[PDB]
Amino acid sequence: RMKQIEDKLEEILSKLYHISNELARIKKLLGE
Amino acid sequence: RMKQIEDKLEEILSKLYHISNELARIKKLLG
Amino acid sequence: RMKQIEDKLEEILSKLYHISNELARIKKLLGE
Amino acid sequence: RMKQIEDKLEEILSKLYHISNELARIKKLLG
């Protein structure tokens, strides 16, 4: 219930870390 | 190549909509 | 407390809507 | 102009780090 929310948050933080890495590779590529 | 960046922006925008949906589900579960 | 979390979520959803709009304008601009 | 897109990617990445920090604070507040 509440722990199910905490687990979903940790999943959502992992998904936003992969998005910030891929946004950083796209900024890199645009910068070349 | 620029096409490859535009496609990865489209995949990011679709993953951003999935997370906003998940966090709206959680904000519902909290009210 | 719990309502403070619900309010922060609504703030974070508004911030991710402005990021998805600006990512969409950047995709538009790259597409021209 | 491409410089303007790279700067707005940098502002998005800095706003993405602020949201992940906020959602880590909330996941702390829930444990």
PDB file of C-alpha atoms in Angstrom, chain C residues 1 4-5 8-9 11-12 15-16 19 22-23 25-26 29-30, chain D residues 2 4-5 8-9 12 15-16 18-19 22-23 25-26 29-30:
ATOM      1  CA  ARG C   1       2.345  16.212   6.265  1.00  0.00           C
ATOM      2  CA  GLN C   4       2.019  18.498   2.018  1.00  0.00           C
ATOM      3  CA  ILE C   5       3.210  15.349  -0.106  1.00  0.00           C
ATOM      4  CA  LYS C   8       4.321  18.643  -3.772  1.00  0.00           C
ATOM      5  CA  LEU C   9       3.231  15.993  -6.312  1.00  0.00           C
ATOM      6  CA  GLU C  11       3.749  20.963  -8.127  1.00  0.00           C
ATOM      7  CA  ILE C  12       6.150  18.241  -9.621  1.00  0.00           C
ATOM      8  CA  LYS C  15       7.002  21.155 -13.572  1.00  0.00           C
ATOM      9  CA  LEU C  16       7.160  17.876 -15.750  1.00  0.00           C
ATOM     10  CA  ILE C  19       9.496  20.092 -19.430  1.00  0.00           C
ATOM     11  CA  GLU C  22       9.766  22.479 -23.924  1.00  0.00           C
ATOM     12  CA  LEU C  23      11.103  19.036 -25.151  1.00  0.00           C
ATOM     13  CA  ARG C  25       9.296  22.628 -28.956  1.00  0.00           C
ATOM     14  CA  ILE C  26      13.052  21.421 -29.129  1.00  0.00           C
ATOM     15  CA  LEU C  29      12.877  23.099 -33.925  1.00  0.00           C
ATOM     16  CA  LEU C  30      15.298  20.106 -34.719  1.00  0.00           C
TER      17      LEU C  30
ATOM     18  CA  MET D   2      21.509  25.219 -32.027  1.00  0.00           C
ATOM     19  CA  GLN D   4      19.942  28.101 -27.736  1.00  0.00           C
ATOM     20  CA  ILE D   5      18.639  24.363 -27.863  1.00  0.00           C
ATOM     21  CA  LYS D   8      17.519  24.898 -22.947  1.00  0.00           C
ATOM     22  CA  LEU D   9      18.639  21.038 -22.670  1.00  0.00           C
ATOM     23  CA  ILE D  12      15.839  20.973 -18.534  1.00  0.00           C
ATOM     24  CA  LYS D  15      15.082  21.105 -13.552  1.00  0.00           C
ATOM     25  CA  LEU D  16      15.008  17.218 -13.930  1.00  0.00           C
ATOM     26  CA  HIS D  18      15.573  19.307  -8.878  1.00  0.00           C
ATOM     27  CA  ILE D  19      12.485  17.010  -9.458  1.00  0.00           C
ATOM     28  CA  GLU D  22      11.983  16.371  -4.530  1.00  0.00           C
ATOM     29  CA  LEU D  23      10.727  12.867  -5.336  1.00  0.00           C
ATOM     30  CA  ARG D  25      12.689  13.620  -0.361  1.00  0.00           C
ATOM     31  CA  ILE D  26       9.020  12.346  -0.660  1.00  0.00           C
ATOM     32  CA  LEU D  29       9.120  11.037   4.078  1.00  0.00           C
ATOM     33  CA  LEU D  30       7.034   7.804   3.080  1.00  0.00           C
TER      34      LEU D  30
END
